[PDB]
């Protein structure tokens, strides 16, 4: 089976930072496009960030200049560096493999709560 295991979330003040990680196994990580998604409570899933197999990246508008996606292929890890956090960023964050196909898979999630 594929496993995607996220961690690094927490409760943080606005303006703070977190670094999420996802540990991947059970598929060929280095040939997959990798994603961060989020689900704010009360809402559905939305995409946050995407990294292709050559390290090129795409971002949702509201996170540009704040969040950075990166991949460490040697260690099967996807990262989300989250700087300058906002209350509106409160959500469960999910790692996902090949969300636009083929064989999409989502992780278990890590909660980020941004509050003063």
């Amino acid at each position: 089976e594929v496993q995607l295991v996220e961690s690094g979330g927490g409760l943080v003040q606005p303006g703070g930072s977190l670094r999420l990680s996802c540990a991947a196994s059970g598929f060929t990580f280095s040939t997959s496009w990798m994603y961060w998604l989020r689900q704010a409570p009360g809402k559905g899933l939305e995409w946050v960030s995407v990294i292709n197999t050559d390290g090129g990246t795409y971002y949702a508008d509201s996170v540009k200049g704040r969040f950075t996606i990166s991949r460490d292929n040697s260690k099967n890890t996807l990262y989300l560096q989250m700087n300058s956090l906002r209350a509106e960023d409160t959500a469960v964050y999910y790692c996902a493999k090949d969300w636009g196909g083929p064989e999409p898979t989502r992780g278990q999630g890590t909660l980020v709560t941004v509050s003063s």
Side-chain angles (χ1 to χ4, degrees), residues 35-38 45-50 57-61 63-64 99:
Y35 295 71
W36 288 99
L37 314 176
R38 69 184 179 187
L45 284 169
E46 66 185 47
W47 79 273
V48 175
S49 309
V50 186
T57 57
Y58 302 79
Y59 295 93
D61 275 29
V63 311
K64 288 175 179 179
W99 200 241

Side-chain angles (χ1 to χ4, degrees), residues 6 35-39 45 92-96 106-109:
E6 304 95 324
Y35 295 71
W36 288 99
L37 314 176
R38 69 184 179 187
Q39 184 175 18
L45 284 169
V92 178
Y93 286 75
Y94 295 99
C95 182
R106 200 211 71 179
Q108 56 184 249

Side-chain angles (χ1 to χ4, degrees), residues 80-92:
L80 191 67
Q81 180 63 44
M82 306 172 85
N83 296 336
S84 205
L85 280 161
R86 296 169 176 174
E88 73 179 24
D89 294 321
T90 292
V92 178

Side-chain angles (χ1 to χ4, degrees), residues 54-71:
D54 83 344
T57 57
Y58 302 79
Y59 295 93
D61 275 29
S62 69
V63 311
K64 288 175 179 179
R66 306 195 300 113
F67 297 2
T68 303
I69 187 171
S70 63
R71 65 196 300 153

Side-chain angles (χ1 to χ4, degrees), residues 4-7 20-24 29 34 36 76-79 95:
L4 296 169
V5 181
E6 304 95 324
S7 65
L20 312 186
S21 72
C22 174
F29 182 85
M34 295 299 302
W36 288 99
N76 270 29
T77 298
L78 192 70
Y79 291 107
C95 182

